[PDB]
Amino acid sequence: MFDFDGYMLRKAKSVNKALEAAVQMKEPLKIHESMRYSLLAGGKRVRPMLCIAACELVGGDESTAMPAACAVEMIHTMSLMHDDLPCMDNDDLRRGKPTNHMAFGESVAVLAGDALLSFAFEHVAAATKGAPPERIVRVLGELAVSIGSEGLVAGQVVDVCSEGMAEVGLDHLEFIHHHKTAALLQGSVVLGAILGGGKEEEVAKLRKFANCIGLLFQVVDDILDVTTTYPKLIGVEKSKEFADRLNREAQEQLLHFHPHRAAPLIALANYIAYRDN
Amino acid sequence: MFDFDGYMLRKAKSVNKALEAAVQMKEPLKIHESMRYSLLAGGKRVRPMLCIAACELVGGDESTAMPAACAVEMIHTMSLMHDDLPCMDNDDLRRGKPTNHMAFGESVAVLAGDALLSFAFEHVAAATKGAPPERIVRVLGELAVSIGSEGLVAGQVVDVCSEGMAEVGLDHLEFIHHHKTAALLQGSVVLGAILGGGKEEEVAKLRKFANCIGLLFQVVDDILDVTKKTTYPKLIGVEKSKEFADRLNREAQEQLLHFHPHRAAPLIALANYIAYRDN
Amino acid sequence: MQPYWAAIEADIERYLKKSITIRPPETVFGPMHHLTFAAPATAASTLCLAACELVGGDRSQAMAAAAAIHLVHAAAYVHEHLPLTDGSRPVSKPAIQHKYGPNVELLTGDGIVPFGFELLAGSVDPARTDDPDRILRVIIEISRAGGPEGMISGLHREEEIVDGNTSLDFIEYVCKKKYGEMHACGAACGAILGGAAEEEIQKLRNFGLYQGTLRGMMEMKNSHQLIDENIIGKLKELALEELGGFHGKNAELMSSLVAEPSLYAAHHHHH
Amino acid sequence: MQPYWAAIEADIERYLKKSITIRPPETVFGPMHHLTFAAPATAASTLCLAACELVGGDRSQAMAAAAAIHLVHAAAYVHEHLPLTDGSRPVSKPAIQHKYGPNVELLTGDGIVPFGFELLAGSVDPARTDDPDRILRVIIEISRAGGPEGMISGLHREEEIVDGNTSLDFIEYVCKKKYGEMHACGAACGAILGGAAEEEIQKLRNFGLYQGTLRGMMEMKNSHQLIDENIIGKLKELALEELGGFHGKNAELMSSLVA
Numbered sequence A: 001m002f003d004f005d006g007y008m009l010r011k012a013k014s015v016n017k018a019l020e021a022a023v024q025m026k027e028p029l030k031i032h033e034s035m036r037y038s039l040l041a042g043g044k045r046v047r048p049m050l051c052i053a054a055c056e057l058v059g060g061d062e063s064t065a066m067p068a069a070c071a072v073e074m075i076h077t078m079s080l081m082h083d084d085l086p087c088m089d090n091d092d093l094r095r096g097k098p099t100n101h102m103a104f105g106e107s108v109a110v111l112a113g114d115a116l117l118s119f120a121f122e123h124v125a126a127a128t129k130g131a132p133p134e135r136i137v138r139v140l141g142e143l144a145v146s147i148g149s150e151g152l153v154a155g156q157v158v159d160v161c162s163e164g165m166a167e168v169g170l171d172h173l174e175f176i177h178h179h180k181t182a183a184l185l186q187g188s189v190v191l192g193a194i195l196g197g198g199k200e201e202e203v204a205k206l207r208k209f210a211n212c213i214g215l216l217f218q219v220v221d222d223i224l225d226v227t228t229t230y231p232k233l234i235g236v237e238k239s240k241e242f243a244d245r246l247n248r249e250a251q252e253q254l255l256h257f258h259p260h261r262a263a264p265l266i267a268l269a270n271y272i273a274y275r276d277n
Numbered sequence B: 001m002f003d004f005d006g007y008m009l010r011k012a013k014s015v016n017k018a019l020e021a022a023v024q025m026k027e028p029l030k031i032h033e034s035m036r037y038s039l040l041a042g043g044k045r046v047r048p049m050l051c052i053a054a055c056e057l058v059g060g061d062e063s064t065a066m067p068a069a070c071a072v073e074m075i076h077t078m079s080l081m082h083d084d085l086p087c088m089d090n091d092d093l094r095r096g097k098p099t100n101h102m103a104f105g106e107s108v109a110v111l112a113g114d115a116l117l118s119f120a121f122e123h124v125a126a127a128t129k130g131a132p133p134e135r136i137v138r139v140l141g142e143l144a145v146s147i148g149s150e151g152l153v154a155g156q157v158v159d160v161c162s163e164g165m166a167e168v169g170l171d172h173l174e175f176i177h178h179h180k181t182a183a184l185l186q187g188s189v190v191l192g193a194i195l196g197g198g199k200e201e202e203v204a205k206l207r208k209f210a211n212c213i214g215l216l217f218q219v220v221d222d223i224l225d226v227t228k229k230t231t232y233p234k235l236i237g238v239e240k241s242k243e244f245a246d247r248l249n250r251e252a253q254e255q256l257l258h259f260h261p262h263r264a265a266p267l268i269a270l271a272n273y274i275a276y277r278d279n
Numbered sequence C: 001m002q003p004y005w006a007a008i009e010a011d012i013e014r015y016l017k018k019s020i021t022i023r024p025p026e027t028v029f030g031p032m033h034h035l036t037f038a039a040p041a042t043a044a045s046t047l048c049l050a051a052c053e054l055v056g057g058d059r060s061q062a063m064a065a066a067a068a069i070h071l072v073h074a075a076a077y078v079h080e081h082l083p084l085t086d087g088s089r090p091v092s093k094p095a096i097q098h099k100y101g102p103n104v105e106l107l108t109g110d111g112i113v114p115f116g117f118e119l120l121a122g123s124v125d126p127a128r129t130d131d132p133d134r135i136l137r138v139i140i141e142i143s144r145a146g147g148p149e150g151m152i153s154g155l156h157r158e159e160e161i162v163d164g165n166t167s168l169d170f171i172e173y174v175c176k177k178k179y180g181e182m183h184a185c186g187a188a189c190g191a192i193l194g195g196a197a198e199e200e201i202q203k204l205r206n207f208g209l210y211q212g213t214l215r216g217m218m219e220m221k222n223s224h225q226l227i228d229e230n231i232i233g234k235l236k237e238l239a240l241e242e243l244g245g246f247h248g249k250n251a252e253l254m255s256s257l258v259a260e261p262s263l264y265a266a267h268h269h270h271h
Numbered sequence D: 001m002q003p004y005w006a007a008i009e010a011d012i013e014r015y016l017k018k019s020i021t022i023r024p025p026e027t028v029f030g031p032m033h034h035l036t037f038a039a040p041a042t043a044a045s046t047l048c049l050a051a052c053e054l055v056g057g058d059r060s061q062a063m064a065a066a067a068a069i070h071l072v073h074a075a076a077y078v079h080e081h082l083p084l085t086d087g088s089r090p091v092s093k094p095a096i097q098h099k100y101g102p103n104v105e106l107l108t109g110d111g112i113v114p115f116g117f118e119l120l121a122g123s124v125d126p127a128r129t130d131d132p133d134r135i136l137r138v139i140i141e142i143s144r145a146g147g148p149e150g151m152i153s154g155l156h157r158e159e160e161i162v163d164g165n166t167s168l169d170f171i172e173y174v175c176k177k178k179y180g181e182m183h184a185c186g187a188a189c190g191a192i193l194g195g196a197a198e199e200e201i202q203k204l205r206n207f208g209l210y211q212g213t214l215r216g217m218m219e220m221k222n223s224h225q226l227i228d229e230n231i232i233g234k235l236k237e238l239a240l241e242e243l244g245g246f247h248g249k250n251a252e253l254m255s256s257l258v259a
Ligand SMILES: [Mg+2]
Pocket: A083, A084, A089, A091
């Protein structure tokens, strides 16, 4: 049988170790202290796991995917650092600890966040071994598309610019969740599938798989964040029904692969569904 | 020689350029900012000149001596940064600008001085080209002896532990001036002459040259203080002080008799300048 | 500014405009387009096309990189002027206009930076053997220059500057980190993308470092009037010294970026 | 173990005592001798001799370097406790005692640093052809470690620490510069002087780095009760890890140092 909880803890331990190693304290000390304060606070490391699992799934190894796995966590980390700022969500705590700008000031939090964003690209470009340059460059491109104006940032921008609304329907809600959540998960799976040497069809299946758990990292999450939403547009009646169809379509994409190789993602997806945080 | 002033200004400009390049701003910025505040303030750069002129005197070239020339100015600079501190001379100004500890705090001034002292050895050790390692290590030991307990620091210590009495005789006054001023001028010419490939016999004459012009400098200063607390005049009178200055200048120049006259010319002109300045 | 540099700047501007087409959702693309052109022009970006041409490549192969460099600079410029609420940084006397609110500006800078890497990754030419390796090297140079030890270190240290109380040594260091490393990055990338050897790359890099530092000093001489000619002359000398060995029409121009050629205009005015 | 380590410390002290003879002028040598021995021992010097023997060198080949390392450390220790008049450096928790005035302490620290280099330069044996190269290399290592980007940076950044209110990441960095760089220096110099090849030097260098960082971590535990065994372990791991490829008592005699 596949021990998913043991698998997750082991990946999270390797990722934490590599993250601590990639971002060391050095001058200017407060900029690096701030980066580490939010990057090394632990957590599930779902994006790094998605990247590593997608790479291993198609035949590559963890060490090849590790810089990219750390990069997507670096992006994820700074997007929360920026999301917590007074001009954005204005949160004083996260994970039960003071938010980055509350510990370091807003000026450091903004720059340490920008530092993590730039360093994500630097680290994947310079530290990735076991993949030819054209492939590393293709991956840098995919990372860029998944976090920019057609990915993570677009979701955030459309979301903050759509606060004073009331006509928000399924299309609007899908755009936001697909961009501010799914886009970086899709990017995480794609960098790994490509770095692992995956064929285009494998990349395509994994890209769709990620989009599905992306939206799912939400639909259920409402029934995880609430208790504009979906149960507001359809009620927990066909809400918990939507997530069940999203999980199924996710798992359907994984049918392309041998089931033994697919177990980590089949499970990273049942968790991602059935999770309370 | 012709245009001694011009010779000195050209040596100072090269050295100023080398100092600026060797001690760049970098993190931690305050330490490096304090180092440069005192090191890059200009000045005659006599110690660097002595080192370069001594190297060229025995056939060597400026490039080989430059790191050591910068090193002796680094020591000279930090000795002044430390001398200005409240527990020492307690000066708020140096050349019309706030002293180092007034601008950066006493803590940084102390550390920045310590940094110049350590970097002087690092720079000579790592940047000198054109010389075998045994020669580089030998000049590192000469630099150390010229500035420690048998050199600059002894002069400073004996001087501050003496500012309490009066029974200070000539021997004692000479001990302070030889250690506080001559020792590092001797280190400067010895570093240059060794790096230039000088024989032990030439190195020995240059030490003597430096020892004389170092004492000459303090004797002449005491004379000028009178013309225009133990001093040469209070001990032997202005007349005998002048006679003494004259013999020191003559003896310094006598050391340079067998070198190439054109090469010796700037050191002879330096000795005369030290002997006959109006200030 | 000189005709040559102005024509190169316009090309970069036309390339960025063709690359950023305002489209739905305009809430994302409107500010993305606006903030890209609202940031000051940077010679780090023109220096990339120029350096490429100086070593004989075609400036067209350095375009994606020149664009990326401007984009990284622009996002930093937007973030540098965000109205923060906690007084964690001085509110630099010069307040600039803001068409969009802090949140949108903040986010847009975050979208602009990756766009530069997107352009670079997507500019790989299949029929070009060495493209991947060169574009990969250039992505590394740019991400480092816009990273924690590059431009961000300069921005961070700039916050410590206190009007008529900060030394020229300190301001020069801030300028080296905030502007010189980026200019050094552009020249080096342009050399790399134009086939230069490690020799010409390192010299053009040092050149950009000094010219960029000097450019930053000139722009800070408007808030700390003490801009001594010593510093200017020092950097200018340091820069020109790196250009010895390029001779010709192209090298003449490059050289002018640091030292303006003798012109009747100048003299006539002083007249 | 303990006696091996204790005899190394005693061997260094006896060599220093032999090198510094109180003599006229006693106003200079009295404090020079006193302050050199009032400074506590630093493991950086011990590591220097232990590293030299680990690679096969004779203890005496590294003695001048170990003595110079103690002298650089002693001068920094005197200077960091000087009673300054402007409140620019907060006085240490327990304030040390001062047998001599601030001027004498300041100057003596300035006389002690060059004495280390004098000892090194003077230790060159003209009958040993490898001495000049190694000693030169060692002078560079030591002057660097005791310089503006080594120990001086840690001493400077240390003043920004707030007891009870500074993160472990910041304190660890201060320990790495203030203590770690000098311990790396000691281990590296010992290797160089014992005739090791570059790969061994680097490993011994890395071990010293982590070891010194740990030791400083501990010297500060008294002011920041947050002695996390987690940071302690991550470091011993990088240290010990670095010893793999040396296997033997040393691959673990050194282990005694991170105990
Ligand atoms: Mg929130």
